[PDB]
Design a binder for this molecule. Structure first.
Ligand SMILES: Nc1ncnc2c1ncn2[C@@H]1O[C@H](COP(=O)(O)O[C@@H]2[C@H](O)[C@@H](COP(=O)(O)O[C@@H]3[C@H](O)[C@@H](COP(=O)(O)O)O[C@H]3n3cnc4c(N)ncnc43)O[C@H]2n2cnc3c(N)ncnc32)[C@@H](O)[C@H]1O
Length: 307
């Protein structure tokens, strides 16, 4: 019982040794008899996981030769193979395939190597996984989710993190389905506009629209791409979104508000003016909203378009 406690320390040390990239210390601890397949209690991480996360092939090899299980999963269900995708290591993906990993295996949240590679903008890994049979259009199914016959896709992921290079490749080279929808009915376009990154959102939006993305999808709360473009207060997105010949300008959100109503509630002078060069002012309480806003430049615009 004093030995059971002392050893667990050696184990944690083996992990820490790996994290510190202390090759010699890892060799001592393993030769010393430390459990090479020890999993810490937090998230089920092993030395091998940590080694893969860090893209240290040499430490992976060492651990494997001391008998590390190459397909042992951590608590989230992710395997070392998957972790190597997040790391973008082709060498490690090639390796874990050779040791029994399935190219379309997934953690307990439906995440596949291919998906992780797109999330982390890992191009070479993406191309590798594709050419090794990765199912590009898989929709995330948690495990106790498949059993009940019941949703995001790699394309969506790349859209939310704003990886332009990856999005081009998925759409042009790998046959990604631009108009797939998750279980809340959001598509790659909606995800791009929901993300925290206004960084490359213009490119992602243009790209998606060229590849025939549906500008008229109902999101979380009736929120269309137009309404998100407006709520973002982005003139460029509203501008590009409106060059879509068949966009339901007057579509209404969850609250009944529309692209124009929200444009005016938010005092967007140019966006409201641009919308009015097509939008229906018959939401009605438009002018009354601009008046509550004390916005007489905007009250004038609304009336010229018959409110
Ligand atoms: N060396 C180590 N590195 C990192 N963590 C370590 C390390 N050593 C010990 N730990 C510790 O163990 C714990 C859990 O770590 P873990 O990563 O193994 O397990 C995570 C979590 O519990 C678990 C679930 O978290 P959640 O409740 O937030 O559930 C999340 C979400 O609701 C769900 C569905 O997403 P979606 O389909 O709706 O888009 O997956 C999460 N998720 C989001 N992006 C993911 C991704 N790219 N890949 C996998 N899962 C993702 O998944 C890990 N995880 C979460 N976000 C991640 C992300 N963005 N990229 C990679 N992995 C991610 C921790 O508590 C931690 O301290």
């Amino acid at each position: 019982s004093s030995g059971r406690r002392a050893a667990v320390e050696d184990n944690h040390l083996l992990i820490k040794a790996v994290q510190n990239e202390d090759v010699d210390l890892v060799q001592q601890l393993l030769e010393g008899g430390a459990n090479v397949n020890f999993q810490e209690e937090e998230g089920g991480w092993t030395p091998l996981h940590n080694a893969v996360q860090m893209s240290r092939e040499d430490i992976v090899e060492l651990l494997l030769r001391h008998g590390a299980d190459p397909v042992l999963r951590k608590k989230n269900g992710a395997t070392p193979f998957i972790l190597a995708a997040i790391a973008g290591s082709v060498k490690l993906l090639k390796l874990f395939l050779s040791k029994g990993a399935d190219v379309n295996e997934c953690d307990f949240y439906g995440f596949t190597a291919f998906m992780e590679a797109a999330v982390y903008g890992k191009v070479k890994a993406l191309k590798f996984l594709y050419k090794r049979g990765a199912n590009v259009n898989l929709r995330r199914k948690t495990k106790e989710d498949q059993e009940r016959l019941r949703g995001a896709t790699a394309l969506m992921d790349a859209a939310e993190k704003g990886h332009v290079e990856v999005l081009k490749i998925l759409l042009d080279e790998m046959g990604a389905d631009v108009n797939a929808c998750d279980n809340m009915g959001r598509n790659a376009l909606i995800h791009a506009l929901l993300s925290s990154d206004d960084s490359d959102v213009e490119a992602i939006t243009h790209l998606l629209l060229d590849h025939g993305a549906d500008v008229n999808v109902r999101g979380e709360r009736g929120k269309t791409p137009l309404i998100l473009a407006v709520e973002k207060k982005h003139l460029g997105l509203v501008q590009r979104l409106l060059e879509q010949e068949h966009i339901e300008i007057n579509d209404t959100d969850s609250d009944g508000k529309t692209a124009l109503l929200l444009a005016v509630e938010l005092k967007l002078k140019k966006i409201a003016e641009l919308l009015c060069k097509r939008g229906a002012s018959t939401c009605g309480d438009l002018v009354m909203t601009a008046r509550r806003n004390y916005d007489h430049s905007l009250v004038k615009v609304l009336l010229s378009h018959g409110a």
